[PDB]
Amino acid sequence: NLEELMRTGDYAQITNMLLNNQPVALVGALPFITDSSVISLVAKLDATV
């Protein structure tokens, strides 16, 4: 839960999961970029954020 993560300030679990490439779902109202470029997908930029 992104709201809980913002409130606690404790980023240990999220940091450990991101460092170790552990599949996860971040839940919360998020702004998103609409990318229409195939090259952006081939560059795998959605994984860089």
Partner 1 sequence: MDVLYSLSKTLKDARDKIVEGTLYSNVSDLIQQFNQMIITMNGNEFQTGGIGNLPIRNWNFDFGLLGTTLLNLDANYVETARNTIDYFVDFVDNVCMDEMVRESQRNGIAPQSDSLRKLSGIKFKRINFDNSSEYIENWNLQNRRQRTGFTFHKPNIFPYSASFTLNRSQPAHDNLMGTMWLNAGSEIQVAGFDYSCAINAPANIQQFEHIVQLRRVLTTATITLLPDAERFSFPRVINSADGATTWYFNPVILRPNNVEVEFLLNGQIINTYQARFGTIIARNFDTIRLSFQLMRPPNMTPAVAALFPNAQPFEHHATVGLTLRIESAVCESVLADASKTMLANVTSVRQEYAIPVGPVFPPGMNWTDLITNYSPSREDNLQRVFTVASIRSMLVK
Under the criterion CB under 8 A, does residue 13 sit at the interface with partner 1?
yes
Residues that contact partner 1, how many (by CB under 8 A): 9
Under the criterion CB under 8 A, does residue 40 sit at the interface with partner 1?
no
Within 8 A by CB and 6+ apart from 46, the residues are 35, 40
Q: Contacting partner 1 (CB under 8 A), which of 2, 17, 18, 26?
A: 17
- State the SS3 of 15-49: HHHHHCCCCCCCCCCCCCCCCCCHHHHHCCHHHHC
Applying CB under 8 A, the residues found at the interface with partner 1 are 8, 10, 12-13, 16-17, 20, 22-23
